[PDB]
Design a binder for this molecule. Structure first.
Ligand SMILES: Nc1cnc2c(c1)COCC2
Ligand SMILES: Nc1cnc2c(c1)COCC2
Length: 330
């Protein structure tokens, strides 16, 4: 089998991407944030505290003839921005782009934190990291990809995120029309439960490439590119007036600037992020200070190849017995 679904930016900045997902019988369609940095499929629901729902579409398990309470199971998760959610668990039928899994754990939110309530465009998350990170207790549950894998034509999914435009998540096949050149594959460590790999270096604009190993994660659920402070300083030094602002929480730059590109290495290959992808707009409405898309990972403990990096490539998440990652230009 295969599946193919369009993913759409939630706003004019590409802060995140939503993909429609069918849950239950009859289908209830929710728009979920596909997140290769976590491993829980959770949704706003009829159980979510009413004051914490503001415009999202909810899953109502009592209206699904295939929903079953997973007795005793609870979940609770926290993300890198300090946001969080928790609740109980149903199993139900879940379909993405024509690909169907029966018996998928659907984690129903009883509580969500303010940043989720405040974002009316995201109805939940669909985790695509390794199932060892799944938070369900006392019986850990499998991701949608892990449950689908045996039925797929090939044990892979691909992320093709757009810049200010829709893109595609495919399951079970590699669309050879969606990229240019060849796909370069690179090793993955699953030891932290992430799609963790090692970039071979970087370049700033037209500058010379610096060969240096940069361990990080491919994370569709993180907006920006978080790299070591040395790398980030070298990038922003090429932008007149750019500076790190403790009050704003990162590097800012004059909105009048034209930003240089940033290149990262994948083996001997190179992925170029155009400068415009690094512009995240005014820090507050009407300001002439703009927020940068490349930020320091120093206070995180891990480097993160988030959407800013991934949307410059066609990315293969290869879930074969030994997982690997593939990157192609497009
Ligand atoms: N830092 C961070 C990483 N991933 C996510 C969030 C924050 C919040 O939305 C869910 C996914
Ligand atoms: N994506 C994104 C993340 N953080 C910030 C902005 C955008 C805007 O400026 C303030 C801080």
């Amino acid at each position: 089998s295969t599946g193919s679904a369009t993913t759409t930016p939630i706003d004019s900045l590409d802060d995140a991407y939503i993909t429609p997902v069918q849950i239950g019988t009859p289908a209830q369609t929710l728009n979920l944030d596909f997140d290769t940095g976590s491993s829980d499929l959770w949704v706003f629901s009829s159980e979510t505290t009413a004051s914490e729902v503001d415009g999202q579409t909810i899953y109502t398990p009592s209206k699904s003839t295939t929903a079953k309470l997973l007795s005793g199971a609870t979940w609770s998760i926290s993300y890198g921005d300090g946001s969080s959610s928790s609740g109980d668990v149903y199993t139900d039928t879940v379909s993405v782009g024509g690909l169907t899994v029966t018996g998928q754990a659907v984690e129903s939110a009883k509580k969500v934190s303010s940043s989720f309530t405040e974002d009316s465009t995201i109805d939940g998350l669909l985790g695509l990291a390794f199932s060892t990170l799944n938070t369900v207790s006392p019986t850990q549950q499998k991701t949608f990809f892990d449950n689908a894998k045996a039925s797929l034509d090939s044990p892979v999914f691909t992320a093709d995120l757009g810049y200010h435009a829709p893109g595609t998540y495919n399951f079970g096949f590699i669309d050879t029309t969606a990229y240019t050149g060849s796909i370069t594959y690179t090793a993955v460590s699953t030891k932290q439960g992430f799609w963790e790999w090692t970039s071979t270096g970087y370049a700033v604009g037209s500058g010379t490439f610096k060969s240096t190993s940069i361990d990080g994660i491919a994370d569709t659920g993180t907006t920006l590119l978080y790299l070591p402070a040395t790398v980030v300083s070298a990038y922003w030094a090429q932008v007149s007036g750019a500076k790190s602002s403790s009050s704003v929480g990162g590097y800012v730059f004059p909105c009048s600037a034209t930003l240089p590109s940033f290149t990262f290495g994948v083996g001997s290959a190179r992925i170029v992020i155009p400068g415009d992808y690094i512009d995240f707009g005014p820090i507050s409405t009407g300001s002439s200070s703009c927020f940068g898309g490349i930020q320091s990972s120093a206070g995180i403990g891990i480097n993160i190849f988030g959407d800013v990096a991934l949307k410059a490539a066609f990315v293969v998440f290869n879930g074969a017995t030994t997982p690997t990652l593939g990157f192609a230009s497009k």
